[PDB]
Paper text:
Cobalamin (Cbl)-dependent radical S-adenosylmethionine (SAM) enzymes constitute a large subclass of radical SAM (RS) enzymes that use Cbl to catalyze various types of reactions, the most common of which are methylations. Bioinformatic analysis of Mmp10 identified [name] (Domain of Unknown Function 512) as a potential Cbl-binding domain in RS enzymes. X-ray crystal structures of [name]-containing proteins from [name] and Pyrococcus furiosus show unique architectural features and confirm the presence of a C-terminal Cbl-binding domain like that of Mmp10. We have uncovered the “Unknown Function” of the [name] domain, which is to bind the biological cofactor Cbl.
csDUF512 was crystallized under anoxic conditions in the presence of AzaSAM, and its structure was determined to a resolution of 1.68 Å. AzaSAM is a SAM analog containing a nitrogen atom in place of SAM’s sulfur atom, and it has been used as a SAM surrogate in several structural studies.19,42,43csDUF512 is composed of three domains (topology diagram in Figure S5A), the first of which (residues 1–80) is a PDZ domain. Of note, csDUF512 is the first structurally characterized RS enzyme with a PDZ domain. The second domain (residues 81–266) of csDUF512 has an unusually short and incomplete β3α4 TIM barrel core. Interestingly, csDUF512 lacks the starting strand (β1) in its RS domain. Instead, a short strand (β5) from the PDZ domain precedes the cluster-loop. Cys87, Cys91, and Cys94 coordinate the FeS cluster of csDUF512. Notably, an aspartate (D112) residue in the middle of a DDD motif located on the cluster loop is observed to coordinate the unique iron of the FeS cluster. The AzaSAM in the csDUF512 structure shows a very different binding pose compared to SAM in the Mmp10 structure.21 Some of the canonical motifs for SAM binding, such as a Glu residue interacting with the ribose moiety of SAM and the GXIXGXXE motif, are not observed. After rotation, the adenosine moiety remains in the same position, but the methyl group of AzaSAM is significantly closer to the cobalt ion.
Numbering used by the authors: 1 to 443
Amino acid sequence: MKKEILKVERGSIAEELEIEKGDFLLSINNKEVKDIIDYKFLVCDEYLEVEIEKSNGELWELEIEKDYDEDLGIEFKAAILDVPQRCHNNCLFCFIDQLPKGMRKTLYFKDDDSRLSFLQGNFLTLTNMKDEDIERIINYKISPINISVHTTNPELRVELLNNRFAGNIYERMKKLAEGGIKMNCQVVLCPGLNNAEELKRTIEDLYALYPQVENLAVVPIGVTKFREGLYRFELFNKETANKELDMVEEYQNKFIKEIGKPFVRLSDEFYVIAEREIPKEEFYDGFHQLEDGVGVIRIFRNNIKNNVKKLSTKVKGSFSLITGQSAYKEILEASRIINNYNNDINIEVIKIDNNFFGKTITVAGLITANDIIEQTQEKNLGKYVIIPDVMLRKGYELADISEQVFLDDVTLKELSKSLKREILVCDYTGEDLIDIINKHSRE
Ligand code: B12
Ligand SMILES: CN(CC[C@H](N)C(=O)O)C[C@H]1O[C@@H](n2cnc3c(N)ncnc32)[C@H](O)[C@@H]1O
Ligand code: SF4
């Protein structure tokens, strides 16, 4: 049951303590690590005594203080009996299947249900998990378990995921709830398949498990232009987004009356498509779903409103902000707020159409360098170009220059040379935009 180490994350605890690829993980707090479920339980602790066998045979005993939810930074080889490295689905909407061919290999990995995704707490369909796995999760009180539900209608879920076990999800969630496990849930909403009365059923079934099921996020199906031969979806438009938002509002009103929270939320893209006003900050209850596209517009507006009073009024600067279709109106309004506060901050916002993936793709993080270059050829860029960090692969801050990459594998430095401008990377929530402008403007 010794576990060969395959990867050590830059900046991690394991790296600090000189754990390396090819070392072996032997035990944590005197317990063997049988698989990823044991591992997740054992690292939920502020103190770990870790036994490592080095590749050269040395035995190390490490004393490790850490935050309870802090990761060690190691990935290790799967056991013969373990959570799989891949999903067991063929979702009708699978985002991997609608990638164009020829991109970097890691983009095609069907790893959203993998052992490493489970460890990170991503949304899981659980179709590749055995009942014994669920029972061990309960016994270990591994919580929360975040679940891609889509529908609690068993036959409908089998049809959406193409896995013969996929109808088990509601019985499995009931088991988790009865075991005291907390769950956050997601639905990918496909008009004519799992919306309307089907989403009503899903909402009702999930709320029956409150407070173990803590909330439900509903996101719209998104497509690229590369769906030849794949299932043909109807997309939400302004009419049907407004209809779905109105339908779900009946449930949100019920839940606000009962428990003081909306429980189910539709993601920001629904409000953009519907041209509907973004809810106030209280609706988002601490903004814990930002990485799932829920509450990002409102927190962005909040961060600009809060921080613009910190913009120096004595400086001058020029900036070009790069964004996509869904965010353009919000970024434009932030630029107007900034320029109203100090009109010597010359800011233009440049919307990039997603010709690479197809213009049905609209969120800012899917903009490629190729499209930025092509669509700024006839622009007079400001001294600094600012992009949001969602346009780069995760880890860019600590990464080597060659590893700060857009989805088309152009690096941040290469794009800067192409644009003949220094490029600044800002937090996609807007938290540091004013600060970056202050630091790059002249008195
Ligand atoms: C929803 C989503 C999708 C949908 C997109 C549908 C659509 N309409 O485009 C789907 C599922 C199709 C999708 C697919 C992919 N996605 Co995706 N997706 C997301 C997600 C979870 C939320 C995006 C969202 O809904 N935003 C809502 C809209 C309204 O806001 P926005 O456009 O994002 O803009 C806001 C902020 O970014 C900010 N902002 C925007 N521009 C600017 C500019 C400046 C200067 C500033 C200050 C702020 C700012 O303010 C806006 C709000 O006011 C993001 C996560 C994230 N943190 O962004 C990942 C994310 C964009 N996806 C990512 C990835 C990797 C992919 C895939 C490549 C995965 C794959 N292996 O195939 C695919 C590619 C396409 C495909 N194969 O279908 C990565 C991209 C990172 C990168 N660039 O390398 C992200 C960032 C998640 C991650 N893992 O880091 N995705
Ligand atoms: C949004 N992605 C993960 C979240 C993202 N990595 C983040 O920032 O947290 C991918 C997930 O979106 C869902 N998904 C897959 N295909 C589509 C699609 N075509 N449209 C919308 N959601 C999809 C699946 O649950 C998939 O695991
Ligand atoms: S679970 Fe579905 S969306 Fe995720 S990789 Fe597997 S088939 Fe694609």
